[PDB]
Amino acid sequence: ASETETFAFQAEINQLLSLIINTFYSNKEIFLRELISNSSDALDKIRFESLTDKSKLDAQPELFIHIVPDKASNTLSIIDSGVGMTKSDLVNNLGTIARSGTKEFMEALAAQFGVGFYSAYLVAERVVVTTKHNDDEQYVWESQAGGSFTVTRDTSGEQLGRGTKITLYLKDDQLEYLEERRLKDLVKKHSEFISYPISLWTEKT
Numbered sequence: 001a002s003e004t005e006t007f008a009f010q011a012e013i014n015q016l017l018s019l020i021i022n023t024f025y026s027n028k029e030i031f032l033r034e035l036i037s038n039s040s041d042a043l044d045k046i047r048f049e050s051l052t053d054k055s056k057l058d059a060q061p062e063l064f065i066h067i068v069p070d071k072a073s074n075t076l077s078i079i080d081s082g083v084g085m086t087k088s089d090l091v092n093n094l095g096t097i098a099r100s101g102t103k104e105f106m107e108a109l110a111a112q113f114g115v116g117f118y119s120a121y122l123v124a125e126r127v128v129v130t131t132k133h134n135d136d137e138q139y140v141w142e143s144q145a146g147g148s149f150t151v152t153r154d155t156s157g158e159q160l161g162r163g164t165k166i167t168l169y170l171k172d173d174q175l176e177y178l179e180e181r182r183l184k185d186l187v188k189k190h191s192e193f194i195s196y197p198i199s200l201w202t203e204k205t
């Protein structure tokens with residue numbers, strides 16, 4: 001049926017990506033704290049609307065963050081019970097939105113506070129976001145950071161019912177972040193100190 005609406009990137013978002021990706025960072029580990037942030041924020045926002053209305057939390061009436069390395073697909077996934085996004089929050093907040101502090105965060109850096117979501121693309125060549133808000137259906141956002149992304153209505157297969165799953169497809173050199181030592185440490189590490197619980201799940205072979 002083609003629920004995919006293919007869009008193109010902000011001109012400045014492109015710059016923002018070019019900064020991140022095309023600068024070798026010793027520690028690209030920044031990205032994880034960056035994602036767990038936006039997740040805490042999402043759990044925080046749903047926890048809020050959950051006072052004014054209790055029909056909200058009913059979806060998954062528990063607030064969690066899951067981290068799944070999967071060596072099959074070489075992906076690292078981040079999963080919360082948080083607010084989620086509508087097609088609008090997808091097409092509007094992810095791709096078309098310059099996060100708070102301007103790219104002059106980094107633009108003046110030619111001459112971390114925080115990078116946010118886009119920090120993901122230093123360890124991954126590709127990323128897919130599967131999300132469920134309450135007022136809207138489940139949508140799927142995907143980009144290779146090649147100056148266009150795609151948003152697709154996903155009414156089929158499995159639903160979270162609420163919240164968001166970010167799955168990043170790691171670059172061939174970046175697979176260290178599929179490791180349990182690497183990650184168990186990083187759980188307990190920067191942004192372990194936080195409101196919600198963090199489960200790391202790994203496959204025993």
Ligand SMILES: Nc1ncnc2c1ncn2[C@@H]1O[C@H](COP(=O)(O)OP(=O)(O)CP(=O)(O)O)[C@@H](O)[C@H]1O
Nearest residue numbers: 038039042084085093094099114115116117118164
């Ligand atoms: N886990 C999540 N659940 C739902 N929406 C999310 C999300 N992570 C990001 N978003 C949406 O995408 C937007 C833009 O992403 P981005 O990470 O660039 O900014 P941010 O609002 O997370 C602050 P920062 O720049 O510090 O991360 C967010 O404002 C939010 O609307």
